[PDB]
């Protein structure tokens, strides 16, 4: 009955799939950054219509507005009833500090953090393998009988993925340390089958 959770993991770690499995078993509200903003705007909340005025103009959403969005979301009814699984926020240590303030104001306590760990070299190989034929557009990872008959999306080039992973690691490290120092972080080995990863998650959550 109700749990207040964060889920964390580097790109390619399968955070999305696990979140959906967590919802199915434990009924917490899965809340990604995208969901939160889409809700605020589509449901036309006070913060949402405010956020929309920046987004429509192609401008960045200020921290003050983002923090209001979050507080608004965690203020909803479903949060009291079912708890939550916050996904993608906080993204920086500053947002972690802002979140803690909001949770304290709301009288809410974080109960656990699911941290899916996968070796960044394994992630790199998994995210930067996709290769595409020039005229048939056939996708690979596997074949390649001709090195020059293929190309990669910019998003999928090893240097691009490597930078993405490095930035995500650097931004996430102080957040993980911040909450680990409070015993809230539970490391899950992510290099398993989907059902085995979730199996370890299930053990953690039922024993909270």
Curated annotation (Swiss-Prot):
Residues 129-156 are annotated as: LID. It catalyses: AMP + ATP = 2 ADP. One of its GO terms (cellular component) is cytoplasm. Keywords: ATP-binding, Cytoplasm, Kinase, Nucleotide biosynthesis, Nucleotide-binding, Transferase. Consists of three domains, a large central CORE domain and two small peripheral domains, NMPbind and LID, which undergo movements during catalysis. The LID domain closes over the site of phosphoryl transfer upon ATP binding. Assembling and dissambling the active center during each catalytic cycle provides an effective means to prevent ATP hydrolysis. It is an enzyme of class 2 (transferase). ATP binds at residues 12-17, 130, 139-140, 192. One of its GO terms (molecular function) is adenylate kinase activity. Pathway: Purine metabolism; AMP biosynthesis via salvage pathway; AMP from ADP: step 1/1. One of its GO terms (biological process) is AMP salvage. Residues 32-61 are annotated as: NMP. Catalyzes the reversible transfer of the terminal phosphate group between ATP and AMP. Plays an important role in cellular energy homeostasis and in adenine nucleotide metabolism. Monomer. This is Adenylate kinase. It is found in: Cytoplasm. AMP binds at residues 33, 38, 59-61, 88-91, 95, 153, 164. Its main location: cytoplasm. Belongs to the adenylate kinase family. InterPro entries: Adenyl_kin_sub, Adenylat/UMP-CMP_kin, Adenylat_kinase_CS, P-loop_NTPase. Its EC number is 2.7.4.3. Pfam families: ADK (PF00406).
């Amino acid at each position: 009955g109700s749990m207040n959770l964060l889920i964390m993991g580097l790109p390619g770690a399968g955070k999305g799939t696990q979140a959906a499995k967590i919802v199915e078993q434990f009924h917490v509200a899965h809340i990604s950054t995208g969901d939160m903003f889409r809700a605020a705007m589509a449901n036309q909340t006070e913060m949402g219509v405010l956020a929309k005025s920046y987004i429509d103009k192609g401008e960045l959403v200020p921290d003050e507005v983002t923090n209001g969005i979050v507080k608004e979301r965690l203020s909803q009814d479903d949060i009291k009833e079912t708890g939550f699984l916050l996904d993608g926020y906080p993204r920086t240590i500053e947002q972690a500090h802002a979140l803690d303030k909001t949770l304290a104001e709301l009288g809410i306590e974080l109960e656990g953090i699911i941290n899916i760990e996968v070796n960044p070299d394994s992630l790199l190989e998994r995210l930067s393998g996709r290769i595409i034929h020039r005229v048939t557009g056939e996708t690979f990872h596997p074949v390649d009988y001709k090195e020059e008959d293929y190309y990669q999306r910019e998003d999928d080039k090893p240097e691009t993925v490597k930078r993405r992973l490095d930035v995500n690691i650097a931004q996430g490290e102080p957040i993980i340390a911040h909450y680990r120092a409070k015993g809230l972080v539970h490391d899950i080995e992510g290099n398993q089958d989907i059902n085995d990863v979730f199996s370890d998650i299930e053990k953690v959550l039922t024993n909270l």
